[PDB]
Amino acid sequence: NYTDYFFDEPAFDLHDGGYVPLEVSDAPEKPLNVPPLLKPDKETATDVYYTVTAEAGETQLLPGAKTKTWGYNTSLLGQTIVYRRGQHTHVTLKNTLPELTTFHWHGANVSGPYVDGGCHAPVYPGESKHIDFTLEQPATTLWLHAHPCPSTAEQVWHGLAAMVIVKDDHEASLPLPRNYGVDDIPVILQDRRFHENNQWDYRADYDPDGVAGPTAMINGTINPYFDVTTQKVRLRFLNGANRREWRLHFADDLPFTQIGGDGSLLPEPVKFTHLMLTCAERAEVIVDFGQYHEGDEVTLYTDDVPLLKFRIHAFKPDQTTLPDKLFDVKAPVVDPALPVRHVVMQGMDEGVAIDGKKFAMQRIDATQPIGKAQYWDVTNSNDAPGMVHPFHVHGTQFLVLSRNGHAPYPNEHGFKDTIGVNPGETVRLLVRFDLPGVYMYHCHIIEHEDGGMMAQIETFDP
Amino acid sequence: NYTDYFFDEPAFDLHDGGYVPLEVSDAPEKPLNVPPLLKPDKETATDVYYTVTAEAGETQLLPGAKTKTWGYNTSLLGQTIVYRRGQHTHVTLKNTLPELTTFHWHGANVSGPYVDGGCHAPVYPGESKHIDFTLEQPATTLWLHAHPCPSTAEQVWHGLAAMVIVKDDHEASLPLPRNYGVDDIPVILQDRRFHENNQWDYRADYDPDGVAGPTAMINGTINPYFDVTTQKVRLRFLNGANRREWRLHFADDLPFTQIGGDGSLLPEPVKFTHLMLTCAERAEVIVDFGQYHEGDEVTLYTDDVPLLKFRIHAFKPDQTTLPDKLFDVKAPVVDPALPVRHVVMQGMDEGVAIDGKKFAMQRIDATQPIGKAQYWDVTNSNDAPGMVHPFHVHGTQFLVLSRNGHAPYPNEHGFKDTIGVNPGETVRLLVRFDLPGVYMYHCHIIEHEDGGMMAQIETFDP
Ligand SMILES: [Cu+2]
Ligand SMILES: [Cu+2]
Ligand SMILES: [Cu+2]
Ligand SMILES: [Cu+2]
Ligand SMILES: [Cu+2]
Ligand SMILES: [Cu+2]
Ligand SMILES: [Cu+2]
Ligand SMILES: [Cu+2]
């Protein structure tokens, strides 16, 4: 028998000796939390004005005491930020936390290293920073998380992540669910461990090879259920876990279509029974509950553990069907002057590194001209047991050309900013930076990021 | 009636609104810890080798559960390291902590920014780093603490601090108590707050204007006594606190003579009843116990709170031959070309800043030519109440020329690397960097450091 998922079975997170299985919680089932859309300060056709505010607070997650949490414009996680292609965006960043944070727009194509908001973009307590940008990139699902170096892991654990939706005119024209909170919803998959008083303790739970709690947390909810009032729903999956891989699938083996990846819509829709997500990967999918009846409760699983209940209410019949081609993927041409960059991800545990060395934040590790496209060959040097390392790159949306010289997985024909690399595997990417600056590339298992599995590239203009 | 101590009374830490008084502990009284000397790996006359290991551990501090602590070559604080002027010193920095740290040699005249061991000298978990240097500076009492930016304050709270003794030919000639752990003892002065199961929690106790607990902790000991077995004892005081000021004095108003500041022997000895130490300051003092007979008991206080009981036993009579002059202070001439540098410390709480801007890792703030000495005028631009900021400079011992135009305090005529600037005060330093590199200057209230009250200077060879 085969494995359903596209990644190499022997390298799944669950064969590790440190593996923490998910347990179903005792807490009562409650409605999936849907983060409200962040009301702009001002909006016109050309200019939008937002205030994003890191803040500390408390949240009812489990019965008893409220869990102390951080979040953007709310106690935990963050109100969902909407950006438009071609719109000039003005964001006031404001830190009201006790510690200093960063504001990373993961997958956004903005100048580094201040707008991109990496290690080099501190915002001290009490401080406000004012950034501005125009996105010239396809409609997709981004996110915002903290990125101090270190500790990105600790801060993300505390609850500093938020969904970011980018819109364009092409996506608006397709026949997709788009009614936010009703048939189009964030599904931000995370795992935590609660201690005494339902409180989190990252340092108590720390493991240099990835932190993973046994209690799953969807949009900062425990045992969520979502009431389905339409035949088709669109889930925007985001893996905001520190290490855990998600092996999503319905109990029924109900199919669903993927229409979106990290960076863009997929070129063509892809049908699925099971779907794996490494860290930071996103997938937009359409589910058809047409076969189910009022009162039926349908469960989404990961491995053998239930995640999310779907309650089926009365819904009017939906006759529409998706086009054969969703999106037109326009691949740059490789600059024949530039050679093939070979990035080598090596090690696990405390010995992670990239191309022989650990992050130094004064040090430029590589260079590349803007506007010009280069082949990257990203390799995972891990050995017999190994692990799938999610490779991420700031300030770009790349294309996947090969996996060990074969075709990329069916959901990889779009633009991506994060790709899972299996042990032994060498993937070929087509990477082009549009704006100059300094960008990191690192494994997005956030413990390895902080373990220094992270280099930075400086882009210039010739 | 006057104030006994040299600093401005209205600006003492105890006038602060969020002041935490020390309270005497319930803990049983017990022998003061004396950190053992770190045994060299190998040692000739011209070369010494050392291994210093950041390691995590537990330490019986109170009866019950062991307090989880950090230390260098031990569970808490650190074994004392001995360096000798002229001797080429080799050190292997081993980090076995779960977080990344840094090995700052406070007051060492060593090249920056790697050896100096500041913000730009990270050492990751499980990683080793080798460094060499030859100290070319007077004998004095230095220390080692962590200096990752941020959080310096968290790591010093966990207990990463260690006394460092520098010896030379001149200091050996003089008649000073010099039998370590018997008549020459460290007195590392710190405070902590204990929570459930005798544990520390820095983030519970966090205050952006300075953390301070109610429990005094001398050399990682609670309610210490020390058995005196010699008429003269030498105390090397170090203020290892995050924020607290120590206002030291004995009962019986027993006098004591100061022979040593931060950077050197004092030119001449200075008698005292009451000494005030701001953060990171050191003071070697001699205490004569000739008045007292066997079975007597003298208590060292801070403000009105007993720190350390001295138990007098039988001792041999001792000469009282402290010379009139201990050390000759060779002051450089300021270079006529160079201007007066003006450093302005400003703020309290979350608004702390130096010269109108917070820290920025990859921003050089100032420059100075190696070997050439310049007047620095450091100002504490604080309001009516305000507080004393201990100003500190990596990579130099400086001299104090004036306080608001008047003479510096009696104990400030030697070399120093940390000085307390009172509100509305302008001290005038004479500063010279011997080796080139990048060095920071900051307040040594460790919370203000982390709040970005810190800049950095770059030294070059012309
Ligand atoms: Cu990210
Ligand atoms: Cu990113
Ligand atoms: Cu990794
Ligand atoms: Cu990143
Ligand atoms: Cu220091
Ligand atoms: Cu220092
Ligand atoms: Cu420092
Ligand atoms: Cu300060």
Residue A159 and residue A182 in one domain: no
Residue A258 and residue A379 in one domain: no
Domain assignment of residue B4, yes or no: no
**CA–CA separation, A65 and A200 (whole Å):** 12
Task: Name residues whose C-beta falls within 8 Å of residue A178's C-beta, 6 or more positions apart in sequence.
Answer: A172, A184, A234
| Backbone discontinuities in chain A, residue before each (C to N > 2.5 A) | none
Supply the CATH number for residue A183's domain.
2.60.40.420
Domain assignment of residue A318, yes or no: no
Structure tokens at B384: 């009516």
Domain assignment of residue B1, yes or no: no
Residue A185 and residue A87 in one domain: no
> In which region does residue A219 sit, left (phi positive, over 0), alpha (psi from -120 to 50) or beta (all else)?
left
- In the DSSP assignment, the letter for residue A198 is G
Compute the count of residue pairs across chains A and B with CB atoms less than 8 Å apart.
49
Instruction: Give the closest-approach CA distance of A102 to chain B in angstroms.
Output: 13
Residues on chain A touching B99 (C-beta within 8 angstroms): 150-151
Say if CB B90 and CB B48 are below 8 A apart: yes
Residue B148 and residue B201 in one domain: no
Distance (Å) from CA B148 to ligand 5 centroid: 11
Residue A301 and residue A358 in one domain: no
The answer to whether A356 faces chain B, any CB pair under 8 Å, is no
Say if CB A182 and CB A232 are below 8 A apart: no
Domain assignment of residue A325, yes or no: no
Say if CB A164 and CB A141 are below 8 A apart: yes
CB contact under 8 A, B124 and A203: no
**CA–CA separation, A373 and B203 (whole Å):** 46
Residue A107 and residue A189 in one domain: no
**CA–CA separation, B151 and A150 (whole Å):** 10
Nearest to A98 among B100, B206, B351 (CB): B206
Resolution to 1 decimal place, in Å: 3.2
**CA–CA separation, B396 and B419 (whole Å):** 13
CB contact under 8 A, B451 and A125: yes
Number of domains in chain B: 3
Question: Which of residues B266, B296, B312 is at a domain's end?
Answer: B312
Question: Which of residues B110, B142, B169 is at a domain's end?
Answer: B169
B42 pairs with which residues across the strands?
Answer: B49
- B235-271 in b/e form (b: 16+ CB < 10 A) is bbbbbbbbbbbbbbbbeeebebbbbbbbbbbbbbbbe
The answer to whether B208 faces chain A, any CB pair under 8 Å, is yes
Closest CA to B374 of B351, B350, B344, B343: B343
Residue B344, class by beta-carbon neighbours within 10 Å (0-12 exposed, 13-18 middle, 19+ buried)? middle
Residue B75 and residue B105 in one domain: yes
Residue B134 and residue B210 in one domain: no
Residue B158 and residue B254 in one domain: no
Question: Which of residues B169, B200, B222 is at a domain's end?
Answer: B169
Domain assignment of residue B8, yes or no: no
Residues on chain B touching A349 (C-beta within 8 angstroms): 126
| Three-class DSSP labels, chain B | CCCCCCCCHHHCHHHCCCCCCCCCCCCCCEECCCCCECCCCEECCCEEEEEEEEEEEEECCCCCCCEEEEEECCCCEECEEEEECCCEEEEEEEEECCCCECCEEECCCCCCCCCCCCCCCCECCCCEEEEEEECCCCCEEEEEECCCCCCHHHHHHHCCEEEEEEECHHHHHCCCCCCECCCEEEEEEEEECCCHHHCCCCCCCCCCCCCCCCEEEECCECCEEEEECCCEEEEEEEECCCCCCEEEEEHHHCCEEEEECCCCEEEEEEEECCEEECCCCEEEEEEECCCCCCCCEEEEEECCEEEEEEEECCCCCCCCCCCCCCCCCCCCCECCCCCCEEEEEECCHHHCEECCECCCCCCCCEEEECCCEEEEEEEEECCCCCCCEEEEECCCCEEEEEECCECCCCCCCCCECEEEECCCCEEEEEECCCCCEEEEEEECCHHHHHCCCEEEEEEECC
Residues on chain B touching A125 (C-beta within 8 angstroms): 208, 350, 451
Place of tokens 């009562």: A28
Q: Hey, what's the torsion of the CAs at A431, A434, A439, A442, to 10 degrees?
A: -30
Domain assignment of residue B332, yes or no: no
Q: How many CA atoms lie within 13 A of B194 on its CB side?
A: 21
The answer to whether A120 faces chain B, any CB pair under 8 Å, is yes
Residue A125 and residue A231 in one domain: no
Which of B96, B350, B438, B450 to mutate to test binding with chain A, by most A CBs within 10 Å of its CB? Answer: B350
Domain assignment of residue A334, yes or no: no
CB contact under 8 A, B350 and A125: yes
Distance (Å) from CA B107 to ligand 5 centroid: 8
Residue A188 and residue A151 in one domain: no
Say if CB A145 and CB A161 are below 8 A apart: yes
Closest CA to B366 of B382, B377, B380, B355: B355
Residue B379 and residue B441 in one domain: yes
Instruction: Return the SS3 of A32.
Output: coil
CB contact under 8 A, B360 and A203: no
Domain assignment of residue B376, yes or no: yes
Say if CB A359 and CB A441 are below 8 A apart: no
Domain that holds residue A358: 341-460
Instruction: Return the SS3 of A180.
Output: strand
CB contact under 8 A, A120 and B361: yes
The answer to whether B197 faces chain A, any CB pair under 8 Å, is no
Residue A101's closest chain B neighbor by CA? B150
